[PDB]
From Swiss-Prot, chains A, B:
This is Queuine tRNA-ribosyltransferase. One of its GO terms (biological process) is queuosine biosynthetic process. It comes from Zymomonas mobilis subsp. mobilis (strain ATCC 31821 / ZM4 / CP4). Residues 248-254, 272-276 are annotated as: RNA binding. Its cofactor is Zn(2+).
Length: 371, 371
């Protein structure tokens, strides 16, 4: 099977639908990746993750390098064997997480030294090596997510450092023949909200050359309007013939609008985390299942959802489970939310393929926001 | 299908194996009932409970009458529909739980008034009605579990009250034609450690007449030796031709020894609760999966277990999950422990049927305690 082959089957405006073929399976795009932070998609067996329609999951390099450790996972046969997921895994680089999760950090041109919340170092070379030891299929270049807001000058110097780190990541990945032959490497565009910096970043990444390109530095507090504004000019700067990835996004309407702007891949903790906290996504908007109005509601979470939860259990039961703090409540909410996200992605893919994505997006928004 | 028909297929010493046929399914005996306290067997979908081999589960009347409430469950179609378990359910009476869980209680001949940890009343008639509203298949008569230790005189007066409550439970159950036609009613023997009181209690229960008989008042701190001593003389006092139930028991060796003394049915929170806390049952004794010795152990929890967990995941992975506080850890530990308990019951049933239970019990104990 191919290491990495991206094919665009159909387009509508800036939106694309297609497939990424990899050795461990095919990824249908636009794709949503459930987040499997600590070698588990929380509250789901891998077979259940797959049953929802997911083609690929995300692993958190920052968490896994601390617990259980990357050398340990490698000794146990790699992340796929360890967690029982045999399909593609994308691993984050650690460059965002180290700054988001660490109790203390020191940043330099070499990388980032940090203290765990549970002293360590990340760098382009170490991040690539950790991702190699994990055995991930899509490796992310180690970057620096510029804080928001940032002065143009600080955004520029941060972006330039990230581009030097992208080149170092490329070189480290290419040096490990088994990794280069079996995995893919994505680069991360930075530049904050500044068009000229985003252009320089895209040019630098294209000159290095990557299998896919993320629009980094978003979903960091700027809000949907500004995120969409940045996507409007940033995505067209990336190579058209490779996948475009938006990290940490998002709500269903964030995804639809990002696809309209040329994004092919997404990951977000929202469906899993908010499911555990009682928020279920429905075609009529999110609901908080703990609310008293659901205590005697015998309808499923969503009456058009195809997931196993909605075939078998009522709102009233899941309301009881979540209020009681029962693990099964988290399980059922999470399975439904991930299945909902996958059904959304399927509707996106089908509508683009069929040349009716614009109408789908309008109809989706009208109903989702009508609640 | 029959409301309730118990058939003994084979005996060895005091041990019996057979079947209870009920409208919602067959129960193979000796039987272990997973505990589904708050309308869920913690961390397991009902299909997974069934896949482990369970024929019947237990529901906690005290919890369910408070949350979500018995009238509410009845309005939603009964406990079976509510939780998605279509096979038999046994409900406890509340008589033990009210005294174990309540913040304050007042006891009288009428029943028990109590304050919830989350003011209420239980009585023979109310307990029967609540169990009716839940729709359970095996209804437990409302009793009083005599504290241990107890003077002979206090054990006698407590037992006599329990027998009056057993008669009131019988009458209330028989008054509700739909309940009497579709469910079974079990009586609970009391009498503490005193042979003469246990005999009076058995005689009273047999004179009232029940579908099954529990040996109550045990597993309340007396220890295994004394429990076995009481079972030695108590079980033969019960009608031989009806099932014998031991509530809240127990560890694998407790079960084996109780079967050797004529017990046919068991429930216990140990496999579920201890699974969530990191204790896995194996044929070589219990293990605490969080222990450092399992961090790189690629064997399954038990290398002879037939459960799905042991086909797919290692000790090392489950060790990581539990240490990380991950829900999947609780799920996998609980599924394995319940499956282990069911495999134990299957080995018990097969060995009795085959006339080799004595040898099985000896071989089981030799290995389980060798660790
Ligand atoms: C290169 N690898 C395996 C690394 C690098 C750094 C660390 C750490 O600081 O804890 C761990 N693994
Ligand atoms: C919101 N999330 C998870 C993000 C955002 C931005 C980045 C990055 O620029 O590297 C990474 N993750
Ligand atoms: C008879 N039933 C339905 C009962 C009895 C008592 C209670 C209570 O005290 O909360 C609830 N339901
Ligand atoms: C240990 N457990 C759950 C018990 C013990 C004893 C009784 C009873 O005598 O009614 C009930 N549950
Ligand atoms: Zn659903
Ligand atoms: Zn097992």
């Amino acid at each position: 099977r191919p290491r990495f082959s991206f094919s665009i089957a159909a387009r509508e405006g800036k939106a694309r639908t297609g497939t990424i073929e990899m050795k461990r399976g095919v990824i249908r795009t636009p794709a949503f990746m459930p987040v499997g932070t600590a070698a588990t998609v929380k509250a789901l067996k891998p077979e259940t993750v797959r049953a929802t329609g997911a083609d690929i999951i995300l692993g958190n390099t920052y968490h896994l390098m601390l617990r259980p450790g990357a050398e340990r996972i490698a000794k146990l046969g790699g992340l796929h064997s360890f967690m029982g997921w045999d399909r593609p895994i994308l691993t984050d680089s650690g460059g965002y997480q180290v700054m988001s999760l660490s109790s203390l950090t020191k940043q330099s041109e070499e990388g980032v030294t940090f203290k765990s919340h549970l002293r360590h170092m990340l760098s382009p070379e170490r991040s690539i090596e950790i991702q190699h030891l994990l055995g991930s299929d899509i490796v992310m270049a180690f970057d620096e997510c510029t804080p928001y807001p940032a002065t143009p000058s600080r955004a520029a110097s941060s972006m330039e450092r990230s581009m030097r780190w992208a080149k170092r990541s490329r070189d480290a990945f290419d040096s490990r023949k088994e990794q280069a032959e079996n995995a893919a490497l994505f680069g991360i565009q930075q530049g904050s909200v500044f068009e000229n910096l985003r252009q320089q970043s895209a040019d630098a990444l294209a000159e290095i050359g990557f299998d896919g390109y993320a629009v980094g530095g978003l979903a960091v507090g700027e809000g949907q309007d500004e995120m969409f504004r940045v996507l409007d000019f940033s995505v067209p700067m990336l190579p058209d013939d490779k996948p475009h990835y938006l990290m940490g996004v998002g709500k269903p309407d964030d995804i639809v609008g990002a696809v309209e702007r040329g994004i092919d891949m997404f990951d977000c903790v929202l469906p899993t985390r908010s499911g555990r906290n009682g928020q279920a996504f429905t075609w009529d908007g999110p609901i908080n299942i703990r609310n008293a109005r659901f205590s005697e509601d015998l309808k499923p979470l969503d009456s058009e959802c195809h997931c196993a939860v909605c075939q078998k259990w009522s709102r009233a039961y899941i309301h009881h489970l979540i209020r009681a703090g029962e693990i099964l409540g988290a399980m059922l909410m999470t399975e439904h939310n991930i299945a909902f996200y996958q059904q959304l992605m399927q509707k996106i893919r089908d509508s683009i393929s069929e040349g009716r994505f614009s109408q789908f997006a309008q109809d989706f928004r009208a109903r989702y926001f009508a609640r």
